[PDB]
Design an enzyme around this catalytic site. Structure first.
Site, mmCIF file in Angstrom:
data_model
loop_
_atom_site.group_PDB
_atom_site.id
_atom_site.type_symbol
_atom_site.label_atom_id
_atom_site.label_comp_id
_atom_site.label_asym_id
_atom_site.label_seq_id
_atom_site.Cartn_x
_atom_site.Cartn_y
_atom_site.Cartn_z
ATOM 1 N N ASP A 1 47.962 -18.345 -31.478
ATOM 2 C CA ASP A 1 47.292 -17.591 -32.520
ATOM 3 C C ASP A 1 48.309 -16.819 -33.356
ATOM 4 O O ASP A 1 49.229 -16.208 -32.805
ATOM 5 C CB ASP A 1 46.272 -16.665 -31.876
ATOM 6 N N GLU B 1 36.694 -17.355 -37.154
ATOM 7 C CA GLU B 1 35.430 -18.018 -36.895
ATOM 8 C C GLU B 1 35.012 -18.964 -38.028
ATOM 9 O O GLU B 1 34.476 -20.032 -37.762
ATOM 10 C CB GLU B 1 34.348 -16.965 -36.636
ATOM 11 N N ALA C 1 36.875 -20.805 -39.875
ATOM 12 C CA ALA C 1 37.681 -22.008 -39.826
ATOM 13 C C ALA C 1 37.728 -22.541 -38.409
ATOM 14 O O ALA C 1 38.636 -23.293 -38.044
ATOM 15 C CB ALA C 1 39.070 -21.735 -40.340
ATOM 16 N N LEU D 1 40.993 -19.698 -30.823
ATOM 17 C CA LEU D 1 42.165 -20.532 -30.609
ATOM 18 C C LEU D 1 41.931 -21.546 -29.467
ATOM 19 O O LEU D 1 42.135 -22.760 -29.628
ATOM 20 C CB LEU D 1 43.392 -19.643 -30.318
ATOM 21 N N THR D 2 41.506 -21.046 -28.317
ATOM 22 C CA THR D 2 41.510 -21.865 -27.115
ATOM 23 C C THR D 2 40.330 -22.835 -27.107
ATOM 24 O O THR D 2 40.385 -23.877 -26.450
ATOM 25 C CB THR D 2 41.484 -20.994 -25.855
ATOM 26 N N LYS E 1 33.470 -25.293 -21.282
ATOM 27 C CA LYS E 1 33.019 -25.575 -22.648
ATOM 28 C C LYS E 1 34.121 -25.404 -23.700
ATOM 29 O O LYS E 1 34.837 -24.409 -23.702
ATOM 30 C CB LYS E 1 31.862 -24.663 -23.039
ATOM 31 N N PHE F 1 47.998 -8.063 -22.333
ATOM 32 C CA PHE F 1 47.707 -8.487 -23.705
ATOM 33 C C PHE F 1 46.623 -7.633 -24.358
ATOM 34 O O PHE F 1 46.604 -7.476 -25.584
ATOM 35 C CB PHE F 1 47.287 -9.974 -23.732
ATOM 36 N N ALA G 1 46.293 -4.558 -24.315
ATOM 37 C CA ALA G 1 46.888 -3.312 -24.800
ATOM 38 C C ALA G 1 46.989 -3.266 -26.320
ATOM 39 O O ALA G 1 46.868 -2.196 -26.918
ATOM 40 C CB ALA G 1 48.259 -3.117 -24.189
ATOM 41 N N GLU H 1 30.435 -9.026 -23.463
ATOM 42 C CA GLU H 1 30.201 -10.202 -22.625
ATOM 43 C C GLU H 1 30.214 -9.834 -21.155
ATOM 44 O O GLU H 1 29.561 -10.482 -20.327
ATOM 45 C CB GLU H 1 31.232 -11.290 -22.903
HETATM 46 N N1 LIG Z 1 33.969 -21.793 -24.710
HETATM 47 C C1 LIG Z 1 33.264 -20.819 -24.174
HETATM 48 O O1 LIG Z 1 32.690 -20.941 -23.076
HETATM 49 C C2 LIG Z 1 33.090 -19.543 -24.973
HETATM 50 C C3 LIG Z 1 33.567 -19.461 -26.268
HETATM 51 N N2 LIG Z 1 33.470 -18.256 -26.976
HETATM 52 C C4 LIG Z 1 34.048 -18.274 -28.367
HETATM 53 O O2 LIG Z 1 35.025 -17.298 -28.506
HETATM 54 C C5 LIG Z 1 35.195 -17.040 -29.918
HETATM 55 C C6 LIG Z 1 35.651 -15.627 -30.165
HETATM 56 O O3 LIG Z 1 36.811 -15.338 -29.364
HETATM 57 P P1 LIG Z 1 37.588 -13.990 -29.679
HETATM 58 O O4 LIG Z 1 38.716 -13.924 -28.727
HETATM 59 O O5 LIG Z 1 36.609 -12.874 -29.715
HETATM 60 O O6 LIG Z 1 38.099 -14.272 -31.173
HETATM 61 P P2 LIG Z 1 39.473 -14.637 -31.913
HETATM 62 O O7 LIG Z 1 40.080 -15.822 -31.266
HETATM 63 O O8 LIG Z 1 39.056 -14.844 -33.348
HETATM 64 O O9 LIG Z 1 40.455 -13.389 -31.779
HETATM 65 C C7 LIG Z 1 40.068 -12.089 -32.275
HETATM 66 C C8 LIG Z 1 41.188 -11.447 -33.064
HETATM 67 O O10 LIG Z 1 42.151 -10.842 -32.172
HETATM 68 C C9 LIG Z 1 43.455 -11.258 -32.530
HETATM 69 N N3 LIG Z 1 44.269 -11.244 -31.318
HETATM 70 C C10 LIG Z 1 44.204 -12.126 -30.272
HETATM 71 N N4 LIG Z 1 44.864 -11.740 -29.211
HETATM 72 C C11 LIG Z 1 45.408 -10.522 -29.580
HETATM 73 C C12 LIG Z 1 46.144 -9.550 -28.870
HETATM 74 N N5 LIG Z 1 46.422 -9.631 -27.568
HETATM 75 N N6 LIG Z 1 46.510 -8.431 -29.531
HETATM 76 C C13 LIG Z 1 46.147 -8.292 -30.809
HETATM 77 N N7 LIG Z 1 45.435 -9.124 -31.570
HETATM 78 C C14 LIG Z 1 45.082 -10.221 -30.890
HETATM 79 C C15 LIG Z 1 43.282 -12.619 -33.195
HETATM 80 O O11 LIG Z 1 44.370 -12.882 -34.075
HETATM 81 C C16 LIG Z 1 41.984 -12.384 -33.977
HETATM 82 O O12 LIG Z 1 42.217 -11.747 -35.226
HETATM 83 C C17 LIG Z 1 33.847 -17.363 -30.540
HETATM 84 O O13 LIG Z 1 34.028 -18.450 -31.438
HETATM 85 C C18 LIG Z 1 33.003 -17.716 -29.318
HETATM 86 O O14 LIG Z 1 32.145 -18.819 -29.583
HETATM 87 C C19 LIG Z 1 32.923 -17.166 -26.406
HETATM 88 C C20 LIG Z 1 32.445 -17.221 -25.115
HETATM 89 C C21 LIG Z 1 32.519 -18.412 -24.401
HETATM 90 ZN ZN LIG Z 2 29.117 -15.609 -25.808
#
Ligand SMILES: NC(=O)C1=CN([C@@H]2O[C@H](COP(=O)(O)OP(=O)(O)OC[C@H]3O[C@@H](n4cnc5c(N)ncnc54)[C@H](O)[C@@H]3O)[C@@H](O)[C@H]2O)C=CC1
Ligand SMILES: [Zn+2]
Ligand SMILES: NC(=O)C1=CN([C@@H]2O[C@H](COP(=O)(O)OP(=O)(O)OC[C@H]3O[C@@H](n4cnc5c(N)ncnc54)[C@H](O)[C@@H]3O)[C@@H](O)[C@H]2O)C=CC1
Ligand SMILES: [Zn+2]
EC number: 4.2.3.152
Lengths: 360, 360
Positions: free
Chosen positions: A38, A69, A71, A104-105, A139, A166, A168, A181
């Protein structure tokens, strides 16, 4: 003919503080490896990460994605596939590393699942959403047009490495976002976890989950999620406790883009559903009060203007199709347990929206 | 944590002459169903298919794709996903029908595998390639840039229905094309099958496999392929007999687009590999002679101008990555058996190309 085959999927979820000196990022990998990271993480932990791998004798290429989100779509997946092609990632002896939040993941996971029809990868979640939900499941997926996670696969990483260090660098908003969550798990599965949040929630946001309560909270969240995923990893059973807070939120999250983060949208759904449960007698006035106070304390929204009766209707209808013609809605029955209902009416939803409106 | 889960995949492969009066297209479905059909098939069997389903009380929408190898890409997959969205295909109680050749069913299979992360479908292969290879496996996928089948999944249909009646409308070229994939099975697994082709190959092309030798030939081909796929359905074992003829052909097929059909490209690879085996002593002069005569009799090519030493090199190298750093090349050892080699040199390939050049 009948063809019948069995598939053993097993993967590891390991808490490994101080990830980037000796601990196995090094042997989670092995050597030459592709790392999809990321952008903001790259800016924040890039210097340290590269110092690790060079000292630990590992050559690498960083594929940097500016992840958000909007993209989180197939074209971004193709960007990751492009990187796998140019790097020459082999069939399976050299796993790809995804290091970022849940956007990302999810993207790299779906690229890896498609690439030659399955390519191993490792996950390093750097957000709270990643560490207790998005980075520990099977998933993956991306959005297709106005539809949340419409395209994807079941493809867990063979290893997830969680380093709470991380967290922090997250800001208060994203820390709370991931706490949403955790609250989901607590409200339908874990009363003690709910208690830990009510008792410590403010401090945990203030301290960004840095240290021993934060450690307990993260451990139970993960343990809670995994107990739910492991015996139903491909969702053959469509009644899912973990679907709590995910019945309305997908359509709400998409309609408000980019105003609501995933956990915030989830919380609107949880607050609606808790009011629903209350109106039904499944929650007391006191318990409902307990839930909505944790939510306000975590500065999480209970409502949004996107959330009109018609959207809530449409949102429910999209979910009934997703759940094969059933609502299968988990409603909290007290705090720390839940029941699945299939008789939620449009009338009940409107009443619950008004009740949220007066609260909010 | 370790999470470990088991997945039972089982599916049906059933020969059902006269598919479009009583036989179960009807209860392969059940009712309202989405049908994704190859354009030419639609033109040829559409009137009959629609008469079937209306008489057998099934409502439907035809999603028509004009399917060809150049457009066997993700954008075509999105077209099928669009159709699933607009039709309102539910999570799993209403399987989607794919009716066409191996391009069609590979596309719909990958759309279905992605849609909500898995959506059941049924396959009705209408070409020979589909009936004995593309429509009975678990593999789906599309090409990504100049790379054959670079993106895909393991997602078998829960049912495949094979009606050899469809082969009646193929032209000689496509009948032979599918005979190439049968020859593949025969050369490394089934000497009796090889004998049936040598003895009947011309007539089978002339009669488009219409009837009892054609029936025997189709049965052994399927049985041969399935014995190979069933215990290794996700290719954990990377030495695969069925990889015969698929070591050079992917790059050759892509570089000659659209001049070579899939089975023709496969045959070039089989003819090269058989010459390789001969030069090695694994095939006698007599046996090599037997193989290349069946190929000329089936009017299948043994060579193409795309097939230069450098392309053959590049083609092999792409495959070594696909096979995780090994060549794992199946070479025929006599007719009806094979060995896996990992010491094929560029020199041997050039000699074999010249030997094909003098033959051809
Ligand atoms: N596959 C699955 O089972 C699941 C998937 N999700 C998906 O997760 C997505 C959201 O994930 P998030 O992590 O909330 O969003 P994200 O990946 O968009 O990250 C959130 C923000 O934090 C920043 N960032 C990341 N790590 C950082 C760090 N350690 N320090 C500072 N900034 C950092 C990123 O650059 C971004 O601006 C949704 O699309 C949701 O659908 C959610 C739950 C379950
Ligand atoms: Zn969720
Ligand atoms: N997934 C798997 O395991 C495998 C996939 N394949 C894939 O199969 C693809 C080729 O499949 P094909 O069926 O050879 O190609 P195809 O799907 O392009 O069909 C060949 C032609 O025949 C026409 N057609 C189809 N059925 C007809 C009928 N009954 N009568 C008259 N015309 C008809 C089609 O319109 C098309 O013009 C390749 O992309 C190959 O990769 C091949 C083997 C295995
Ligand atoms: Zn083939």
């Amino acid at each position: 003919w009948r063809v019948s085959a069995l598939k053993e999927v097993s993967y590891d979820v390991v808490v490994q503080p101080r990830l980037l000196a000796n601990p196995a990022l090094a042997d989670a990998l092995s050597a030459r490896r592709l790392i999809v990271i990321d952008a903001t993480v790259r800016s924040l932990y890039g210097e340290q990460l590269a110092a690790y791998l060079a000292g630990h004798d590992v050559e690498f290429h960083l594929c940097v994605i500016d992840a958000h989100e909007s993209a989180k779509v197939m074209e971004t997946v193709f960007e990751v596939v492009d990187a796998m092609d140019a790097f020459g990632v082999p069939r399976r002896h050299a796993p790809v590393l995804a290091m970022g939040g849940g956007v990302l993941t999810d993207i790299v996971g779906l690229a890896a699942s498609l690439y030659r029809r399955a390519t191993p990868y490792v996950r390093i979640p750097t957000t709270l959403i990643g560490m207790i939900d998005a980075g520990i499941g099977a998933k993956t997926g991306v959005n297709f047009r106005e539809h949340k996670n419409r395209l994807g696969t079941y493809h867990p990483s063979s290893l997830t490495l969680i380093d709470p260090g991380f967290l922090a660098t997250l800001d208060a908003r994203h820390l709370r976002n991931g706490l949403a969550e955790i609250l989901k798990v607590a409200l339908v599965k874990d009363a003690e976890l709910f208690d830990l949040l009510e008792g410590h929630g403010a401090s945990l946001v203030e301290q960004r989950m840095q240290p021993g309560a934060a450690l307990t909270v993260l451990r139970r969240a993960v343990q809670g999620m995994l107990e739910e995923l492991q015996p139903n990893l491909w969702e053959h059973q469509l009644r899912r406790l973990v679907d709590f807070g995910h019945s309305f939120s997908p359509s709400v999250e998409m309609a408000a883009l980019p105003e609501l983060l995933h956990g915030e949208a989830v919380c609107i759904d949880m607050a609606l559903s808790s009011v629903l449960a209350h109106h039904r007698g499944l929650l007391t006035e006191a318990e409902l009060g307990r839930v909505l106070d944790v939510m306000r304390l975590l500065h999480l929204p209970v409502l949004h203007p996107v959330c009109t009766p018609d959207l809530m209707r449409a949102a429910l209808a999209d979910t009934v199709k997703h759940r094969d013609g059933w609502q299968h809605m988990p409603l909290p029955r007290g705090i720390g347990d839940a029941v699945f209902v299939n008789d939620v009416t449009q009338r009940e939803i409107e009443a619950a929206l008004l009740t949220l409106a007066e609260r909010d």
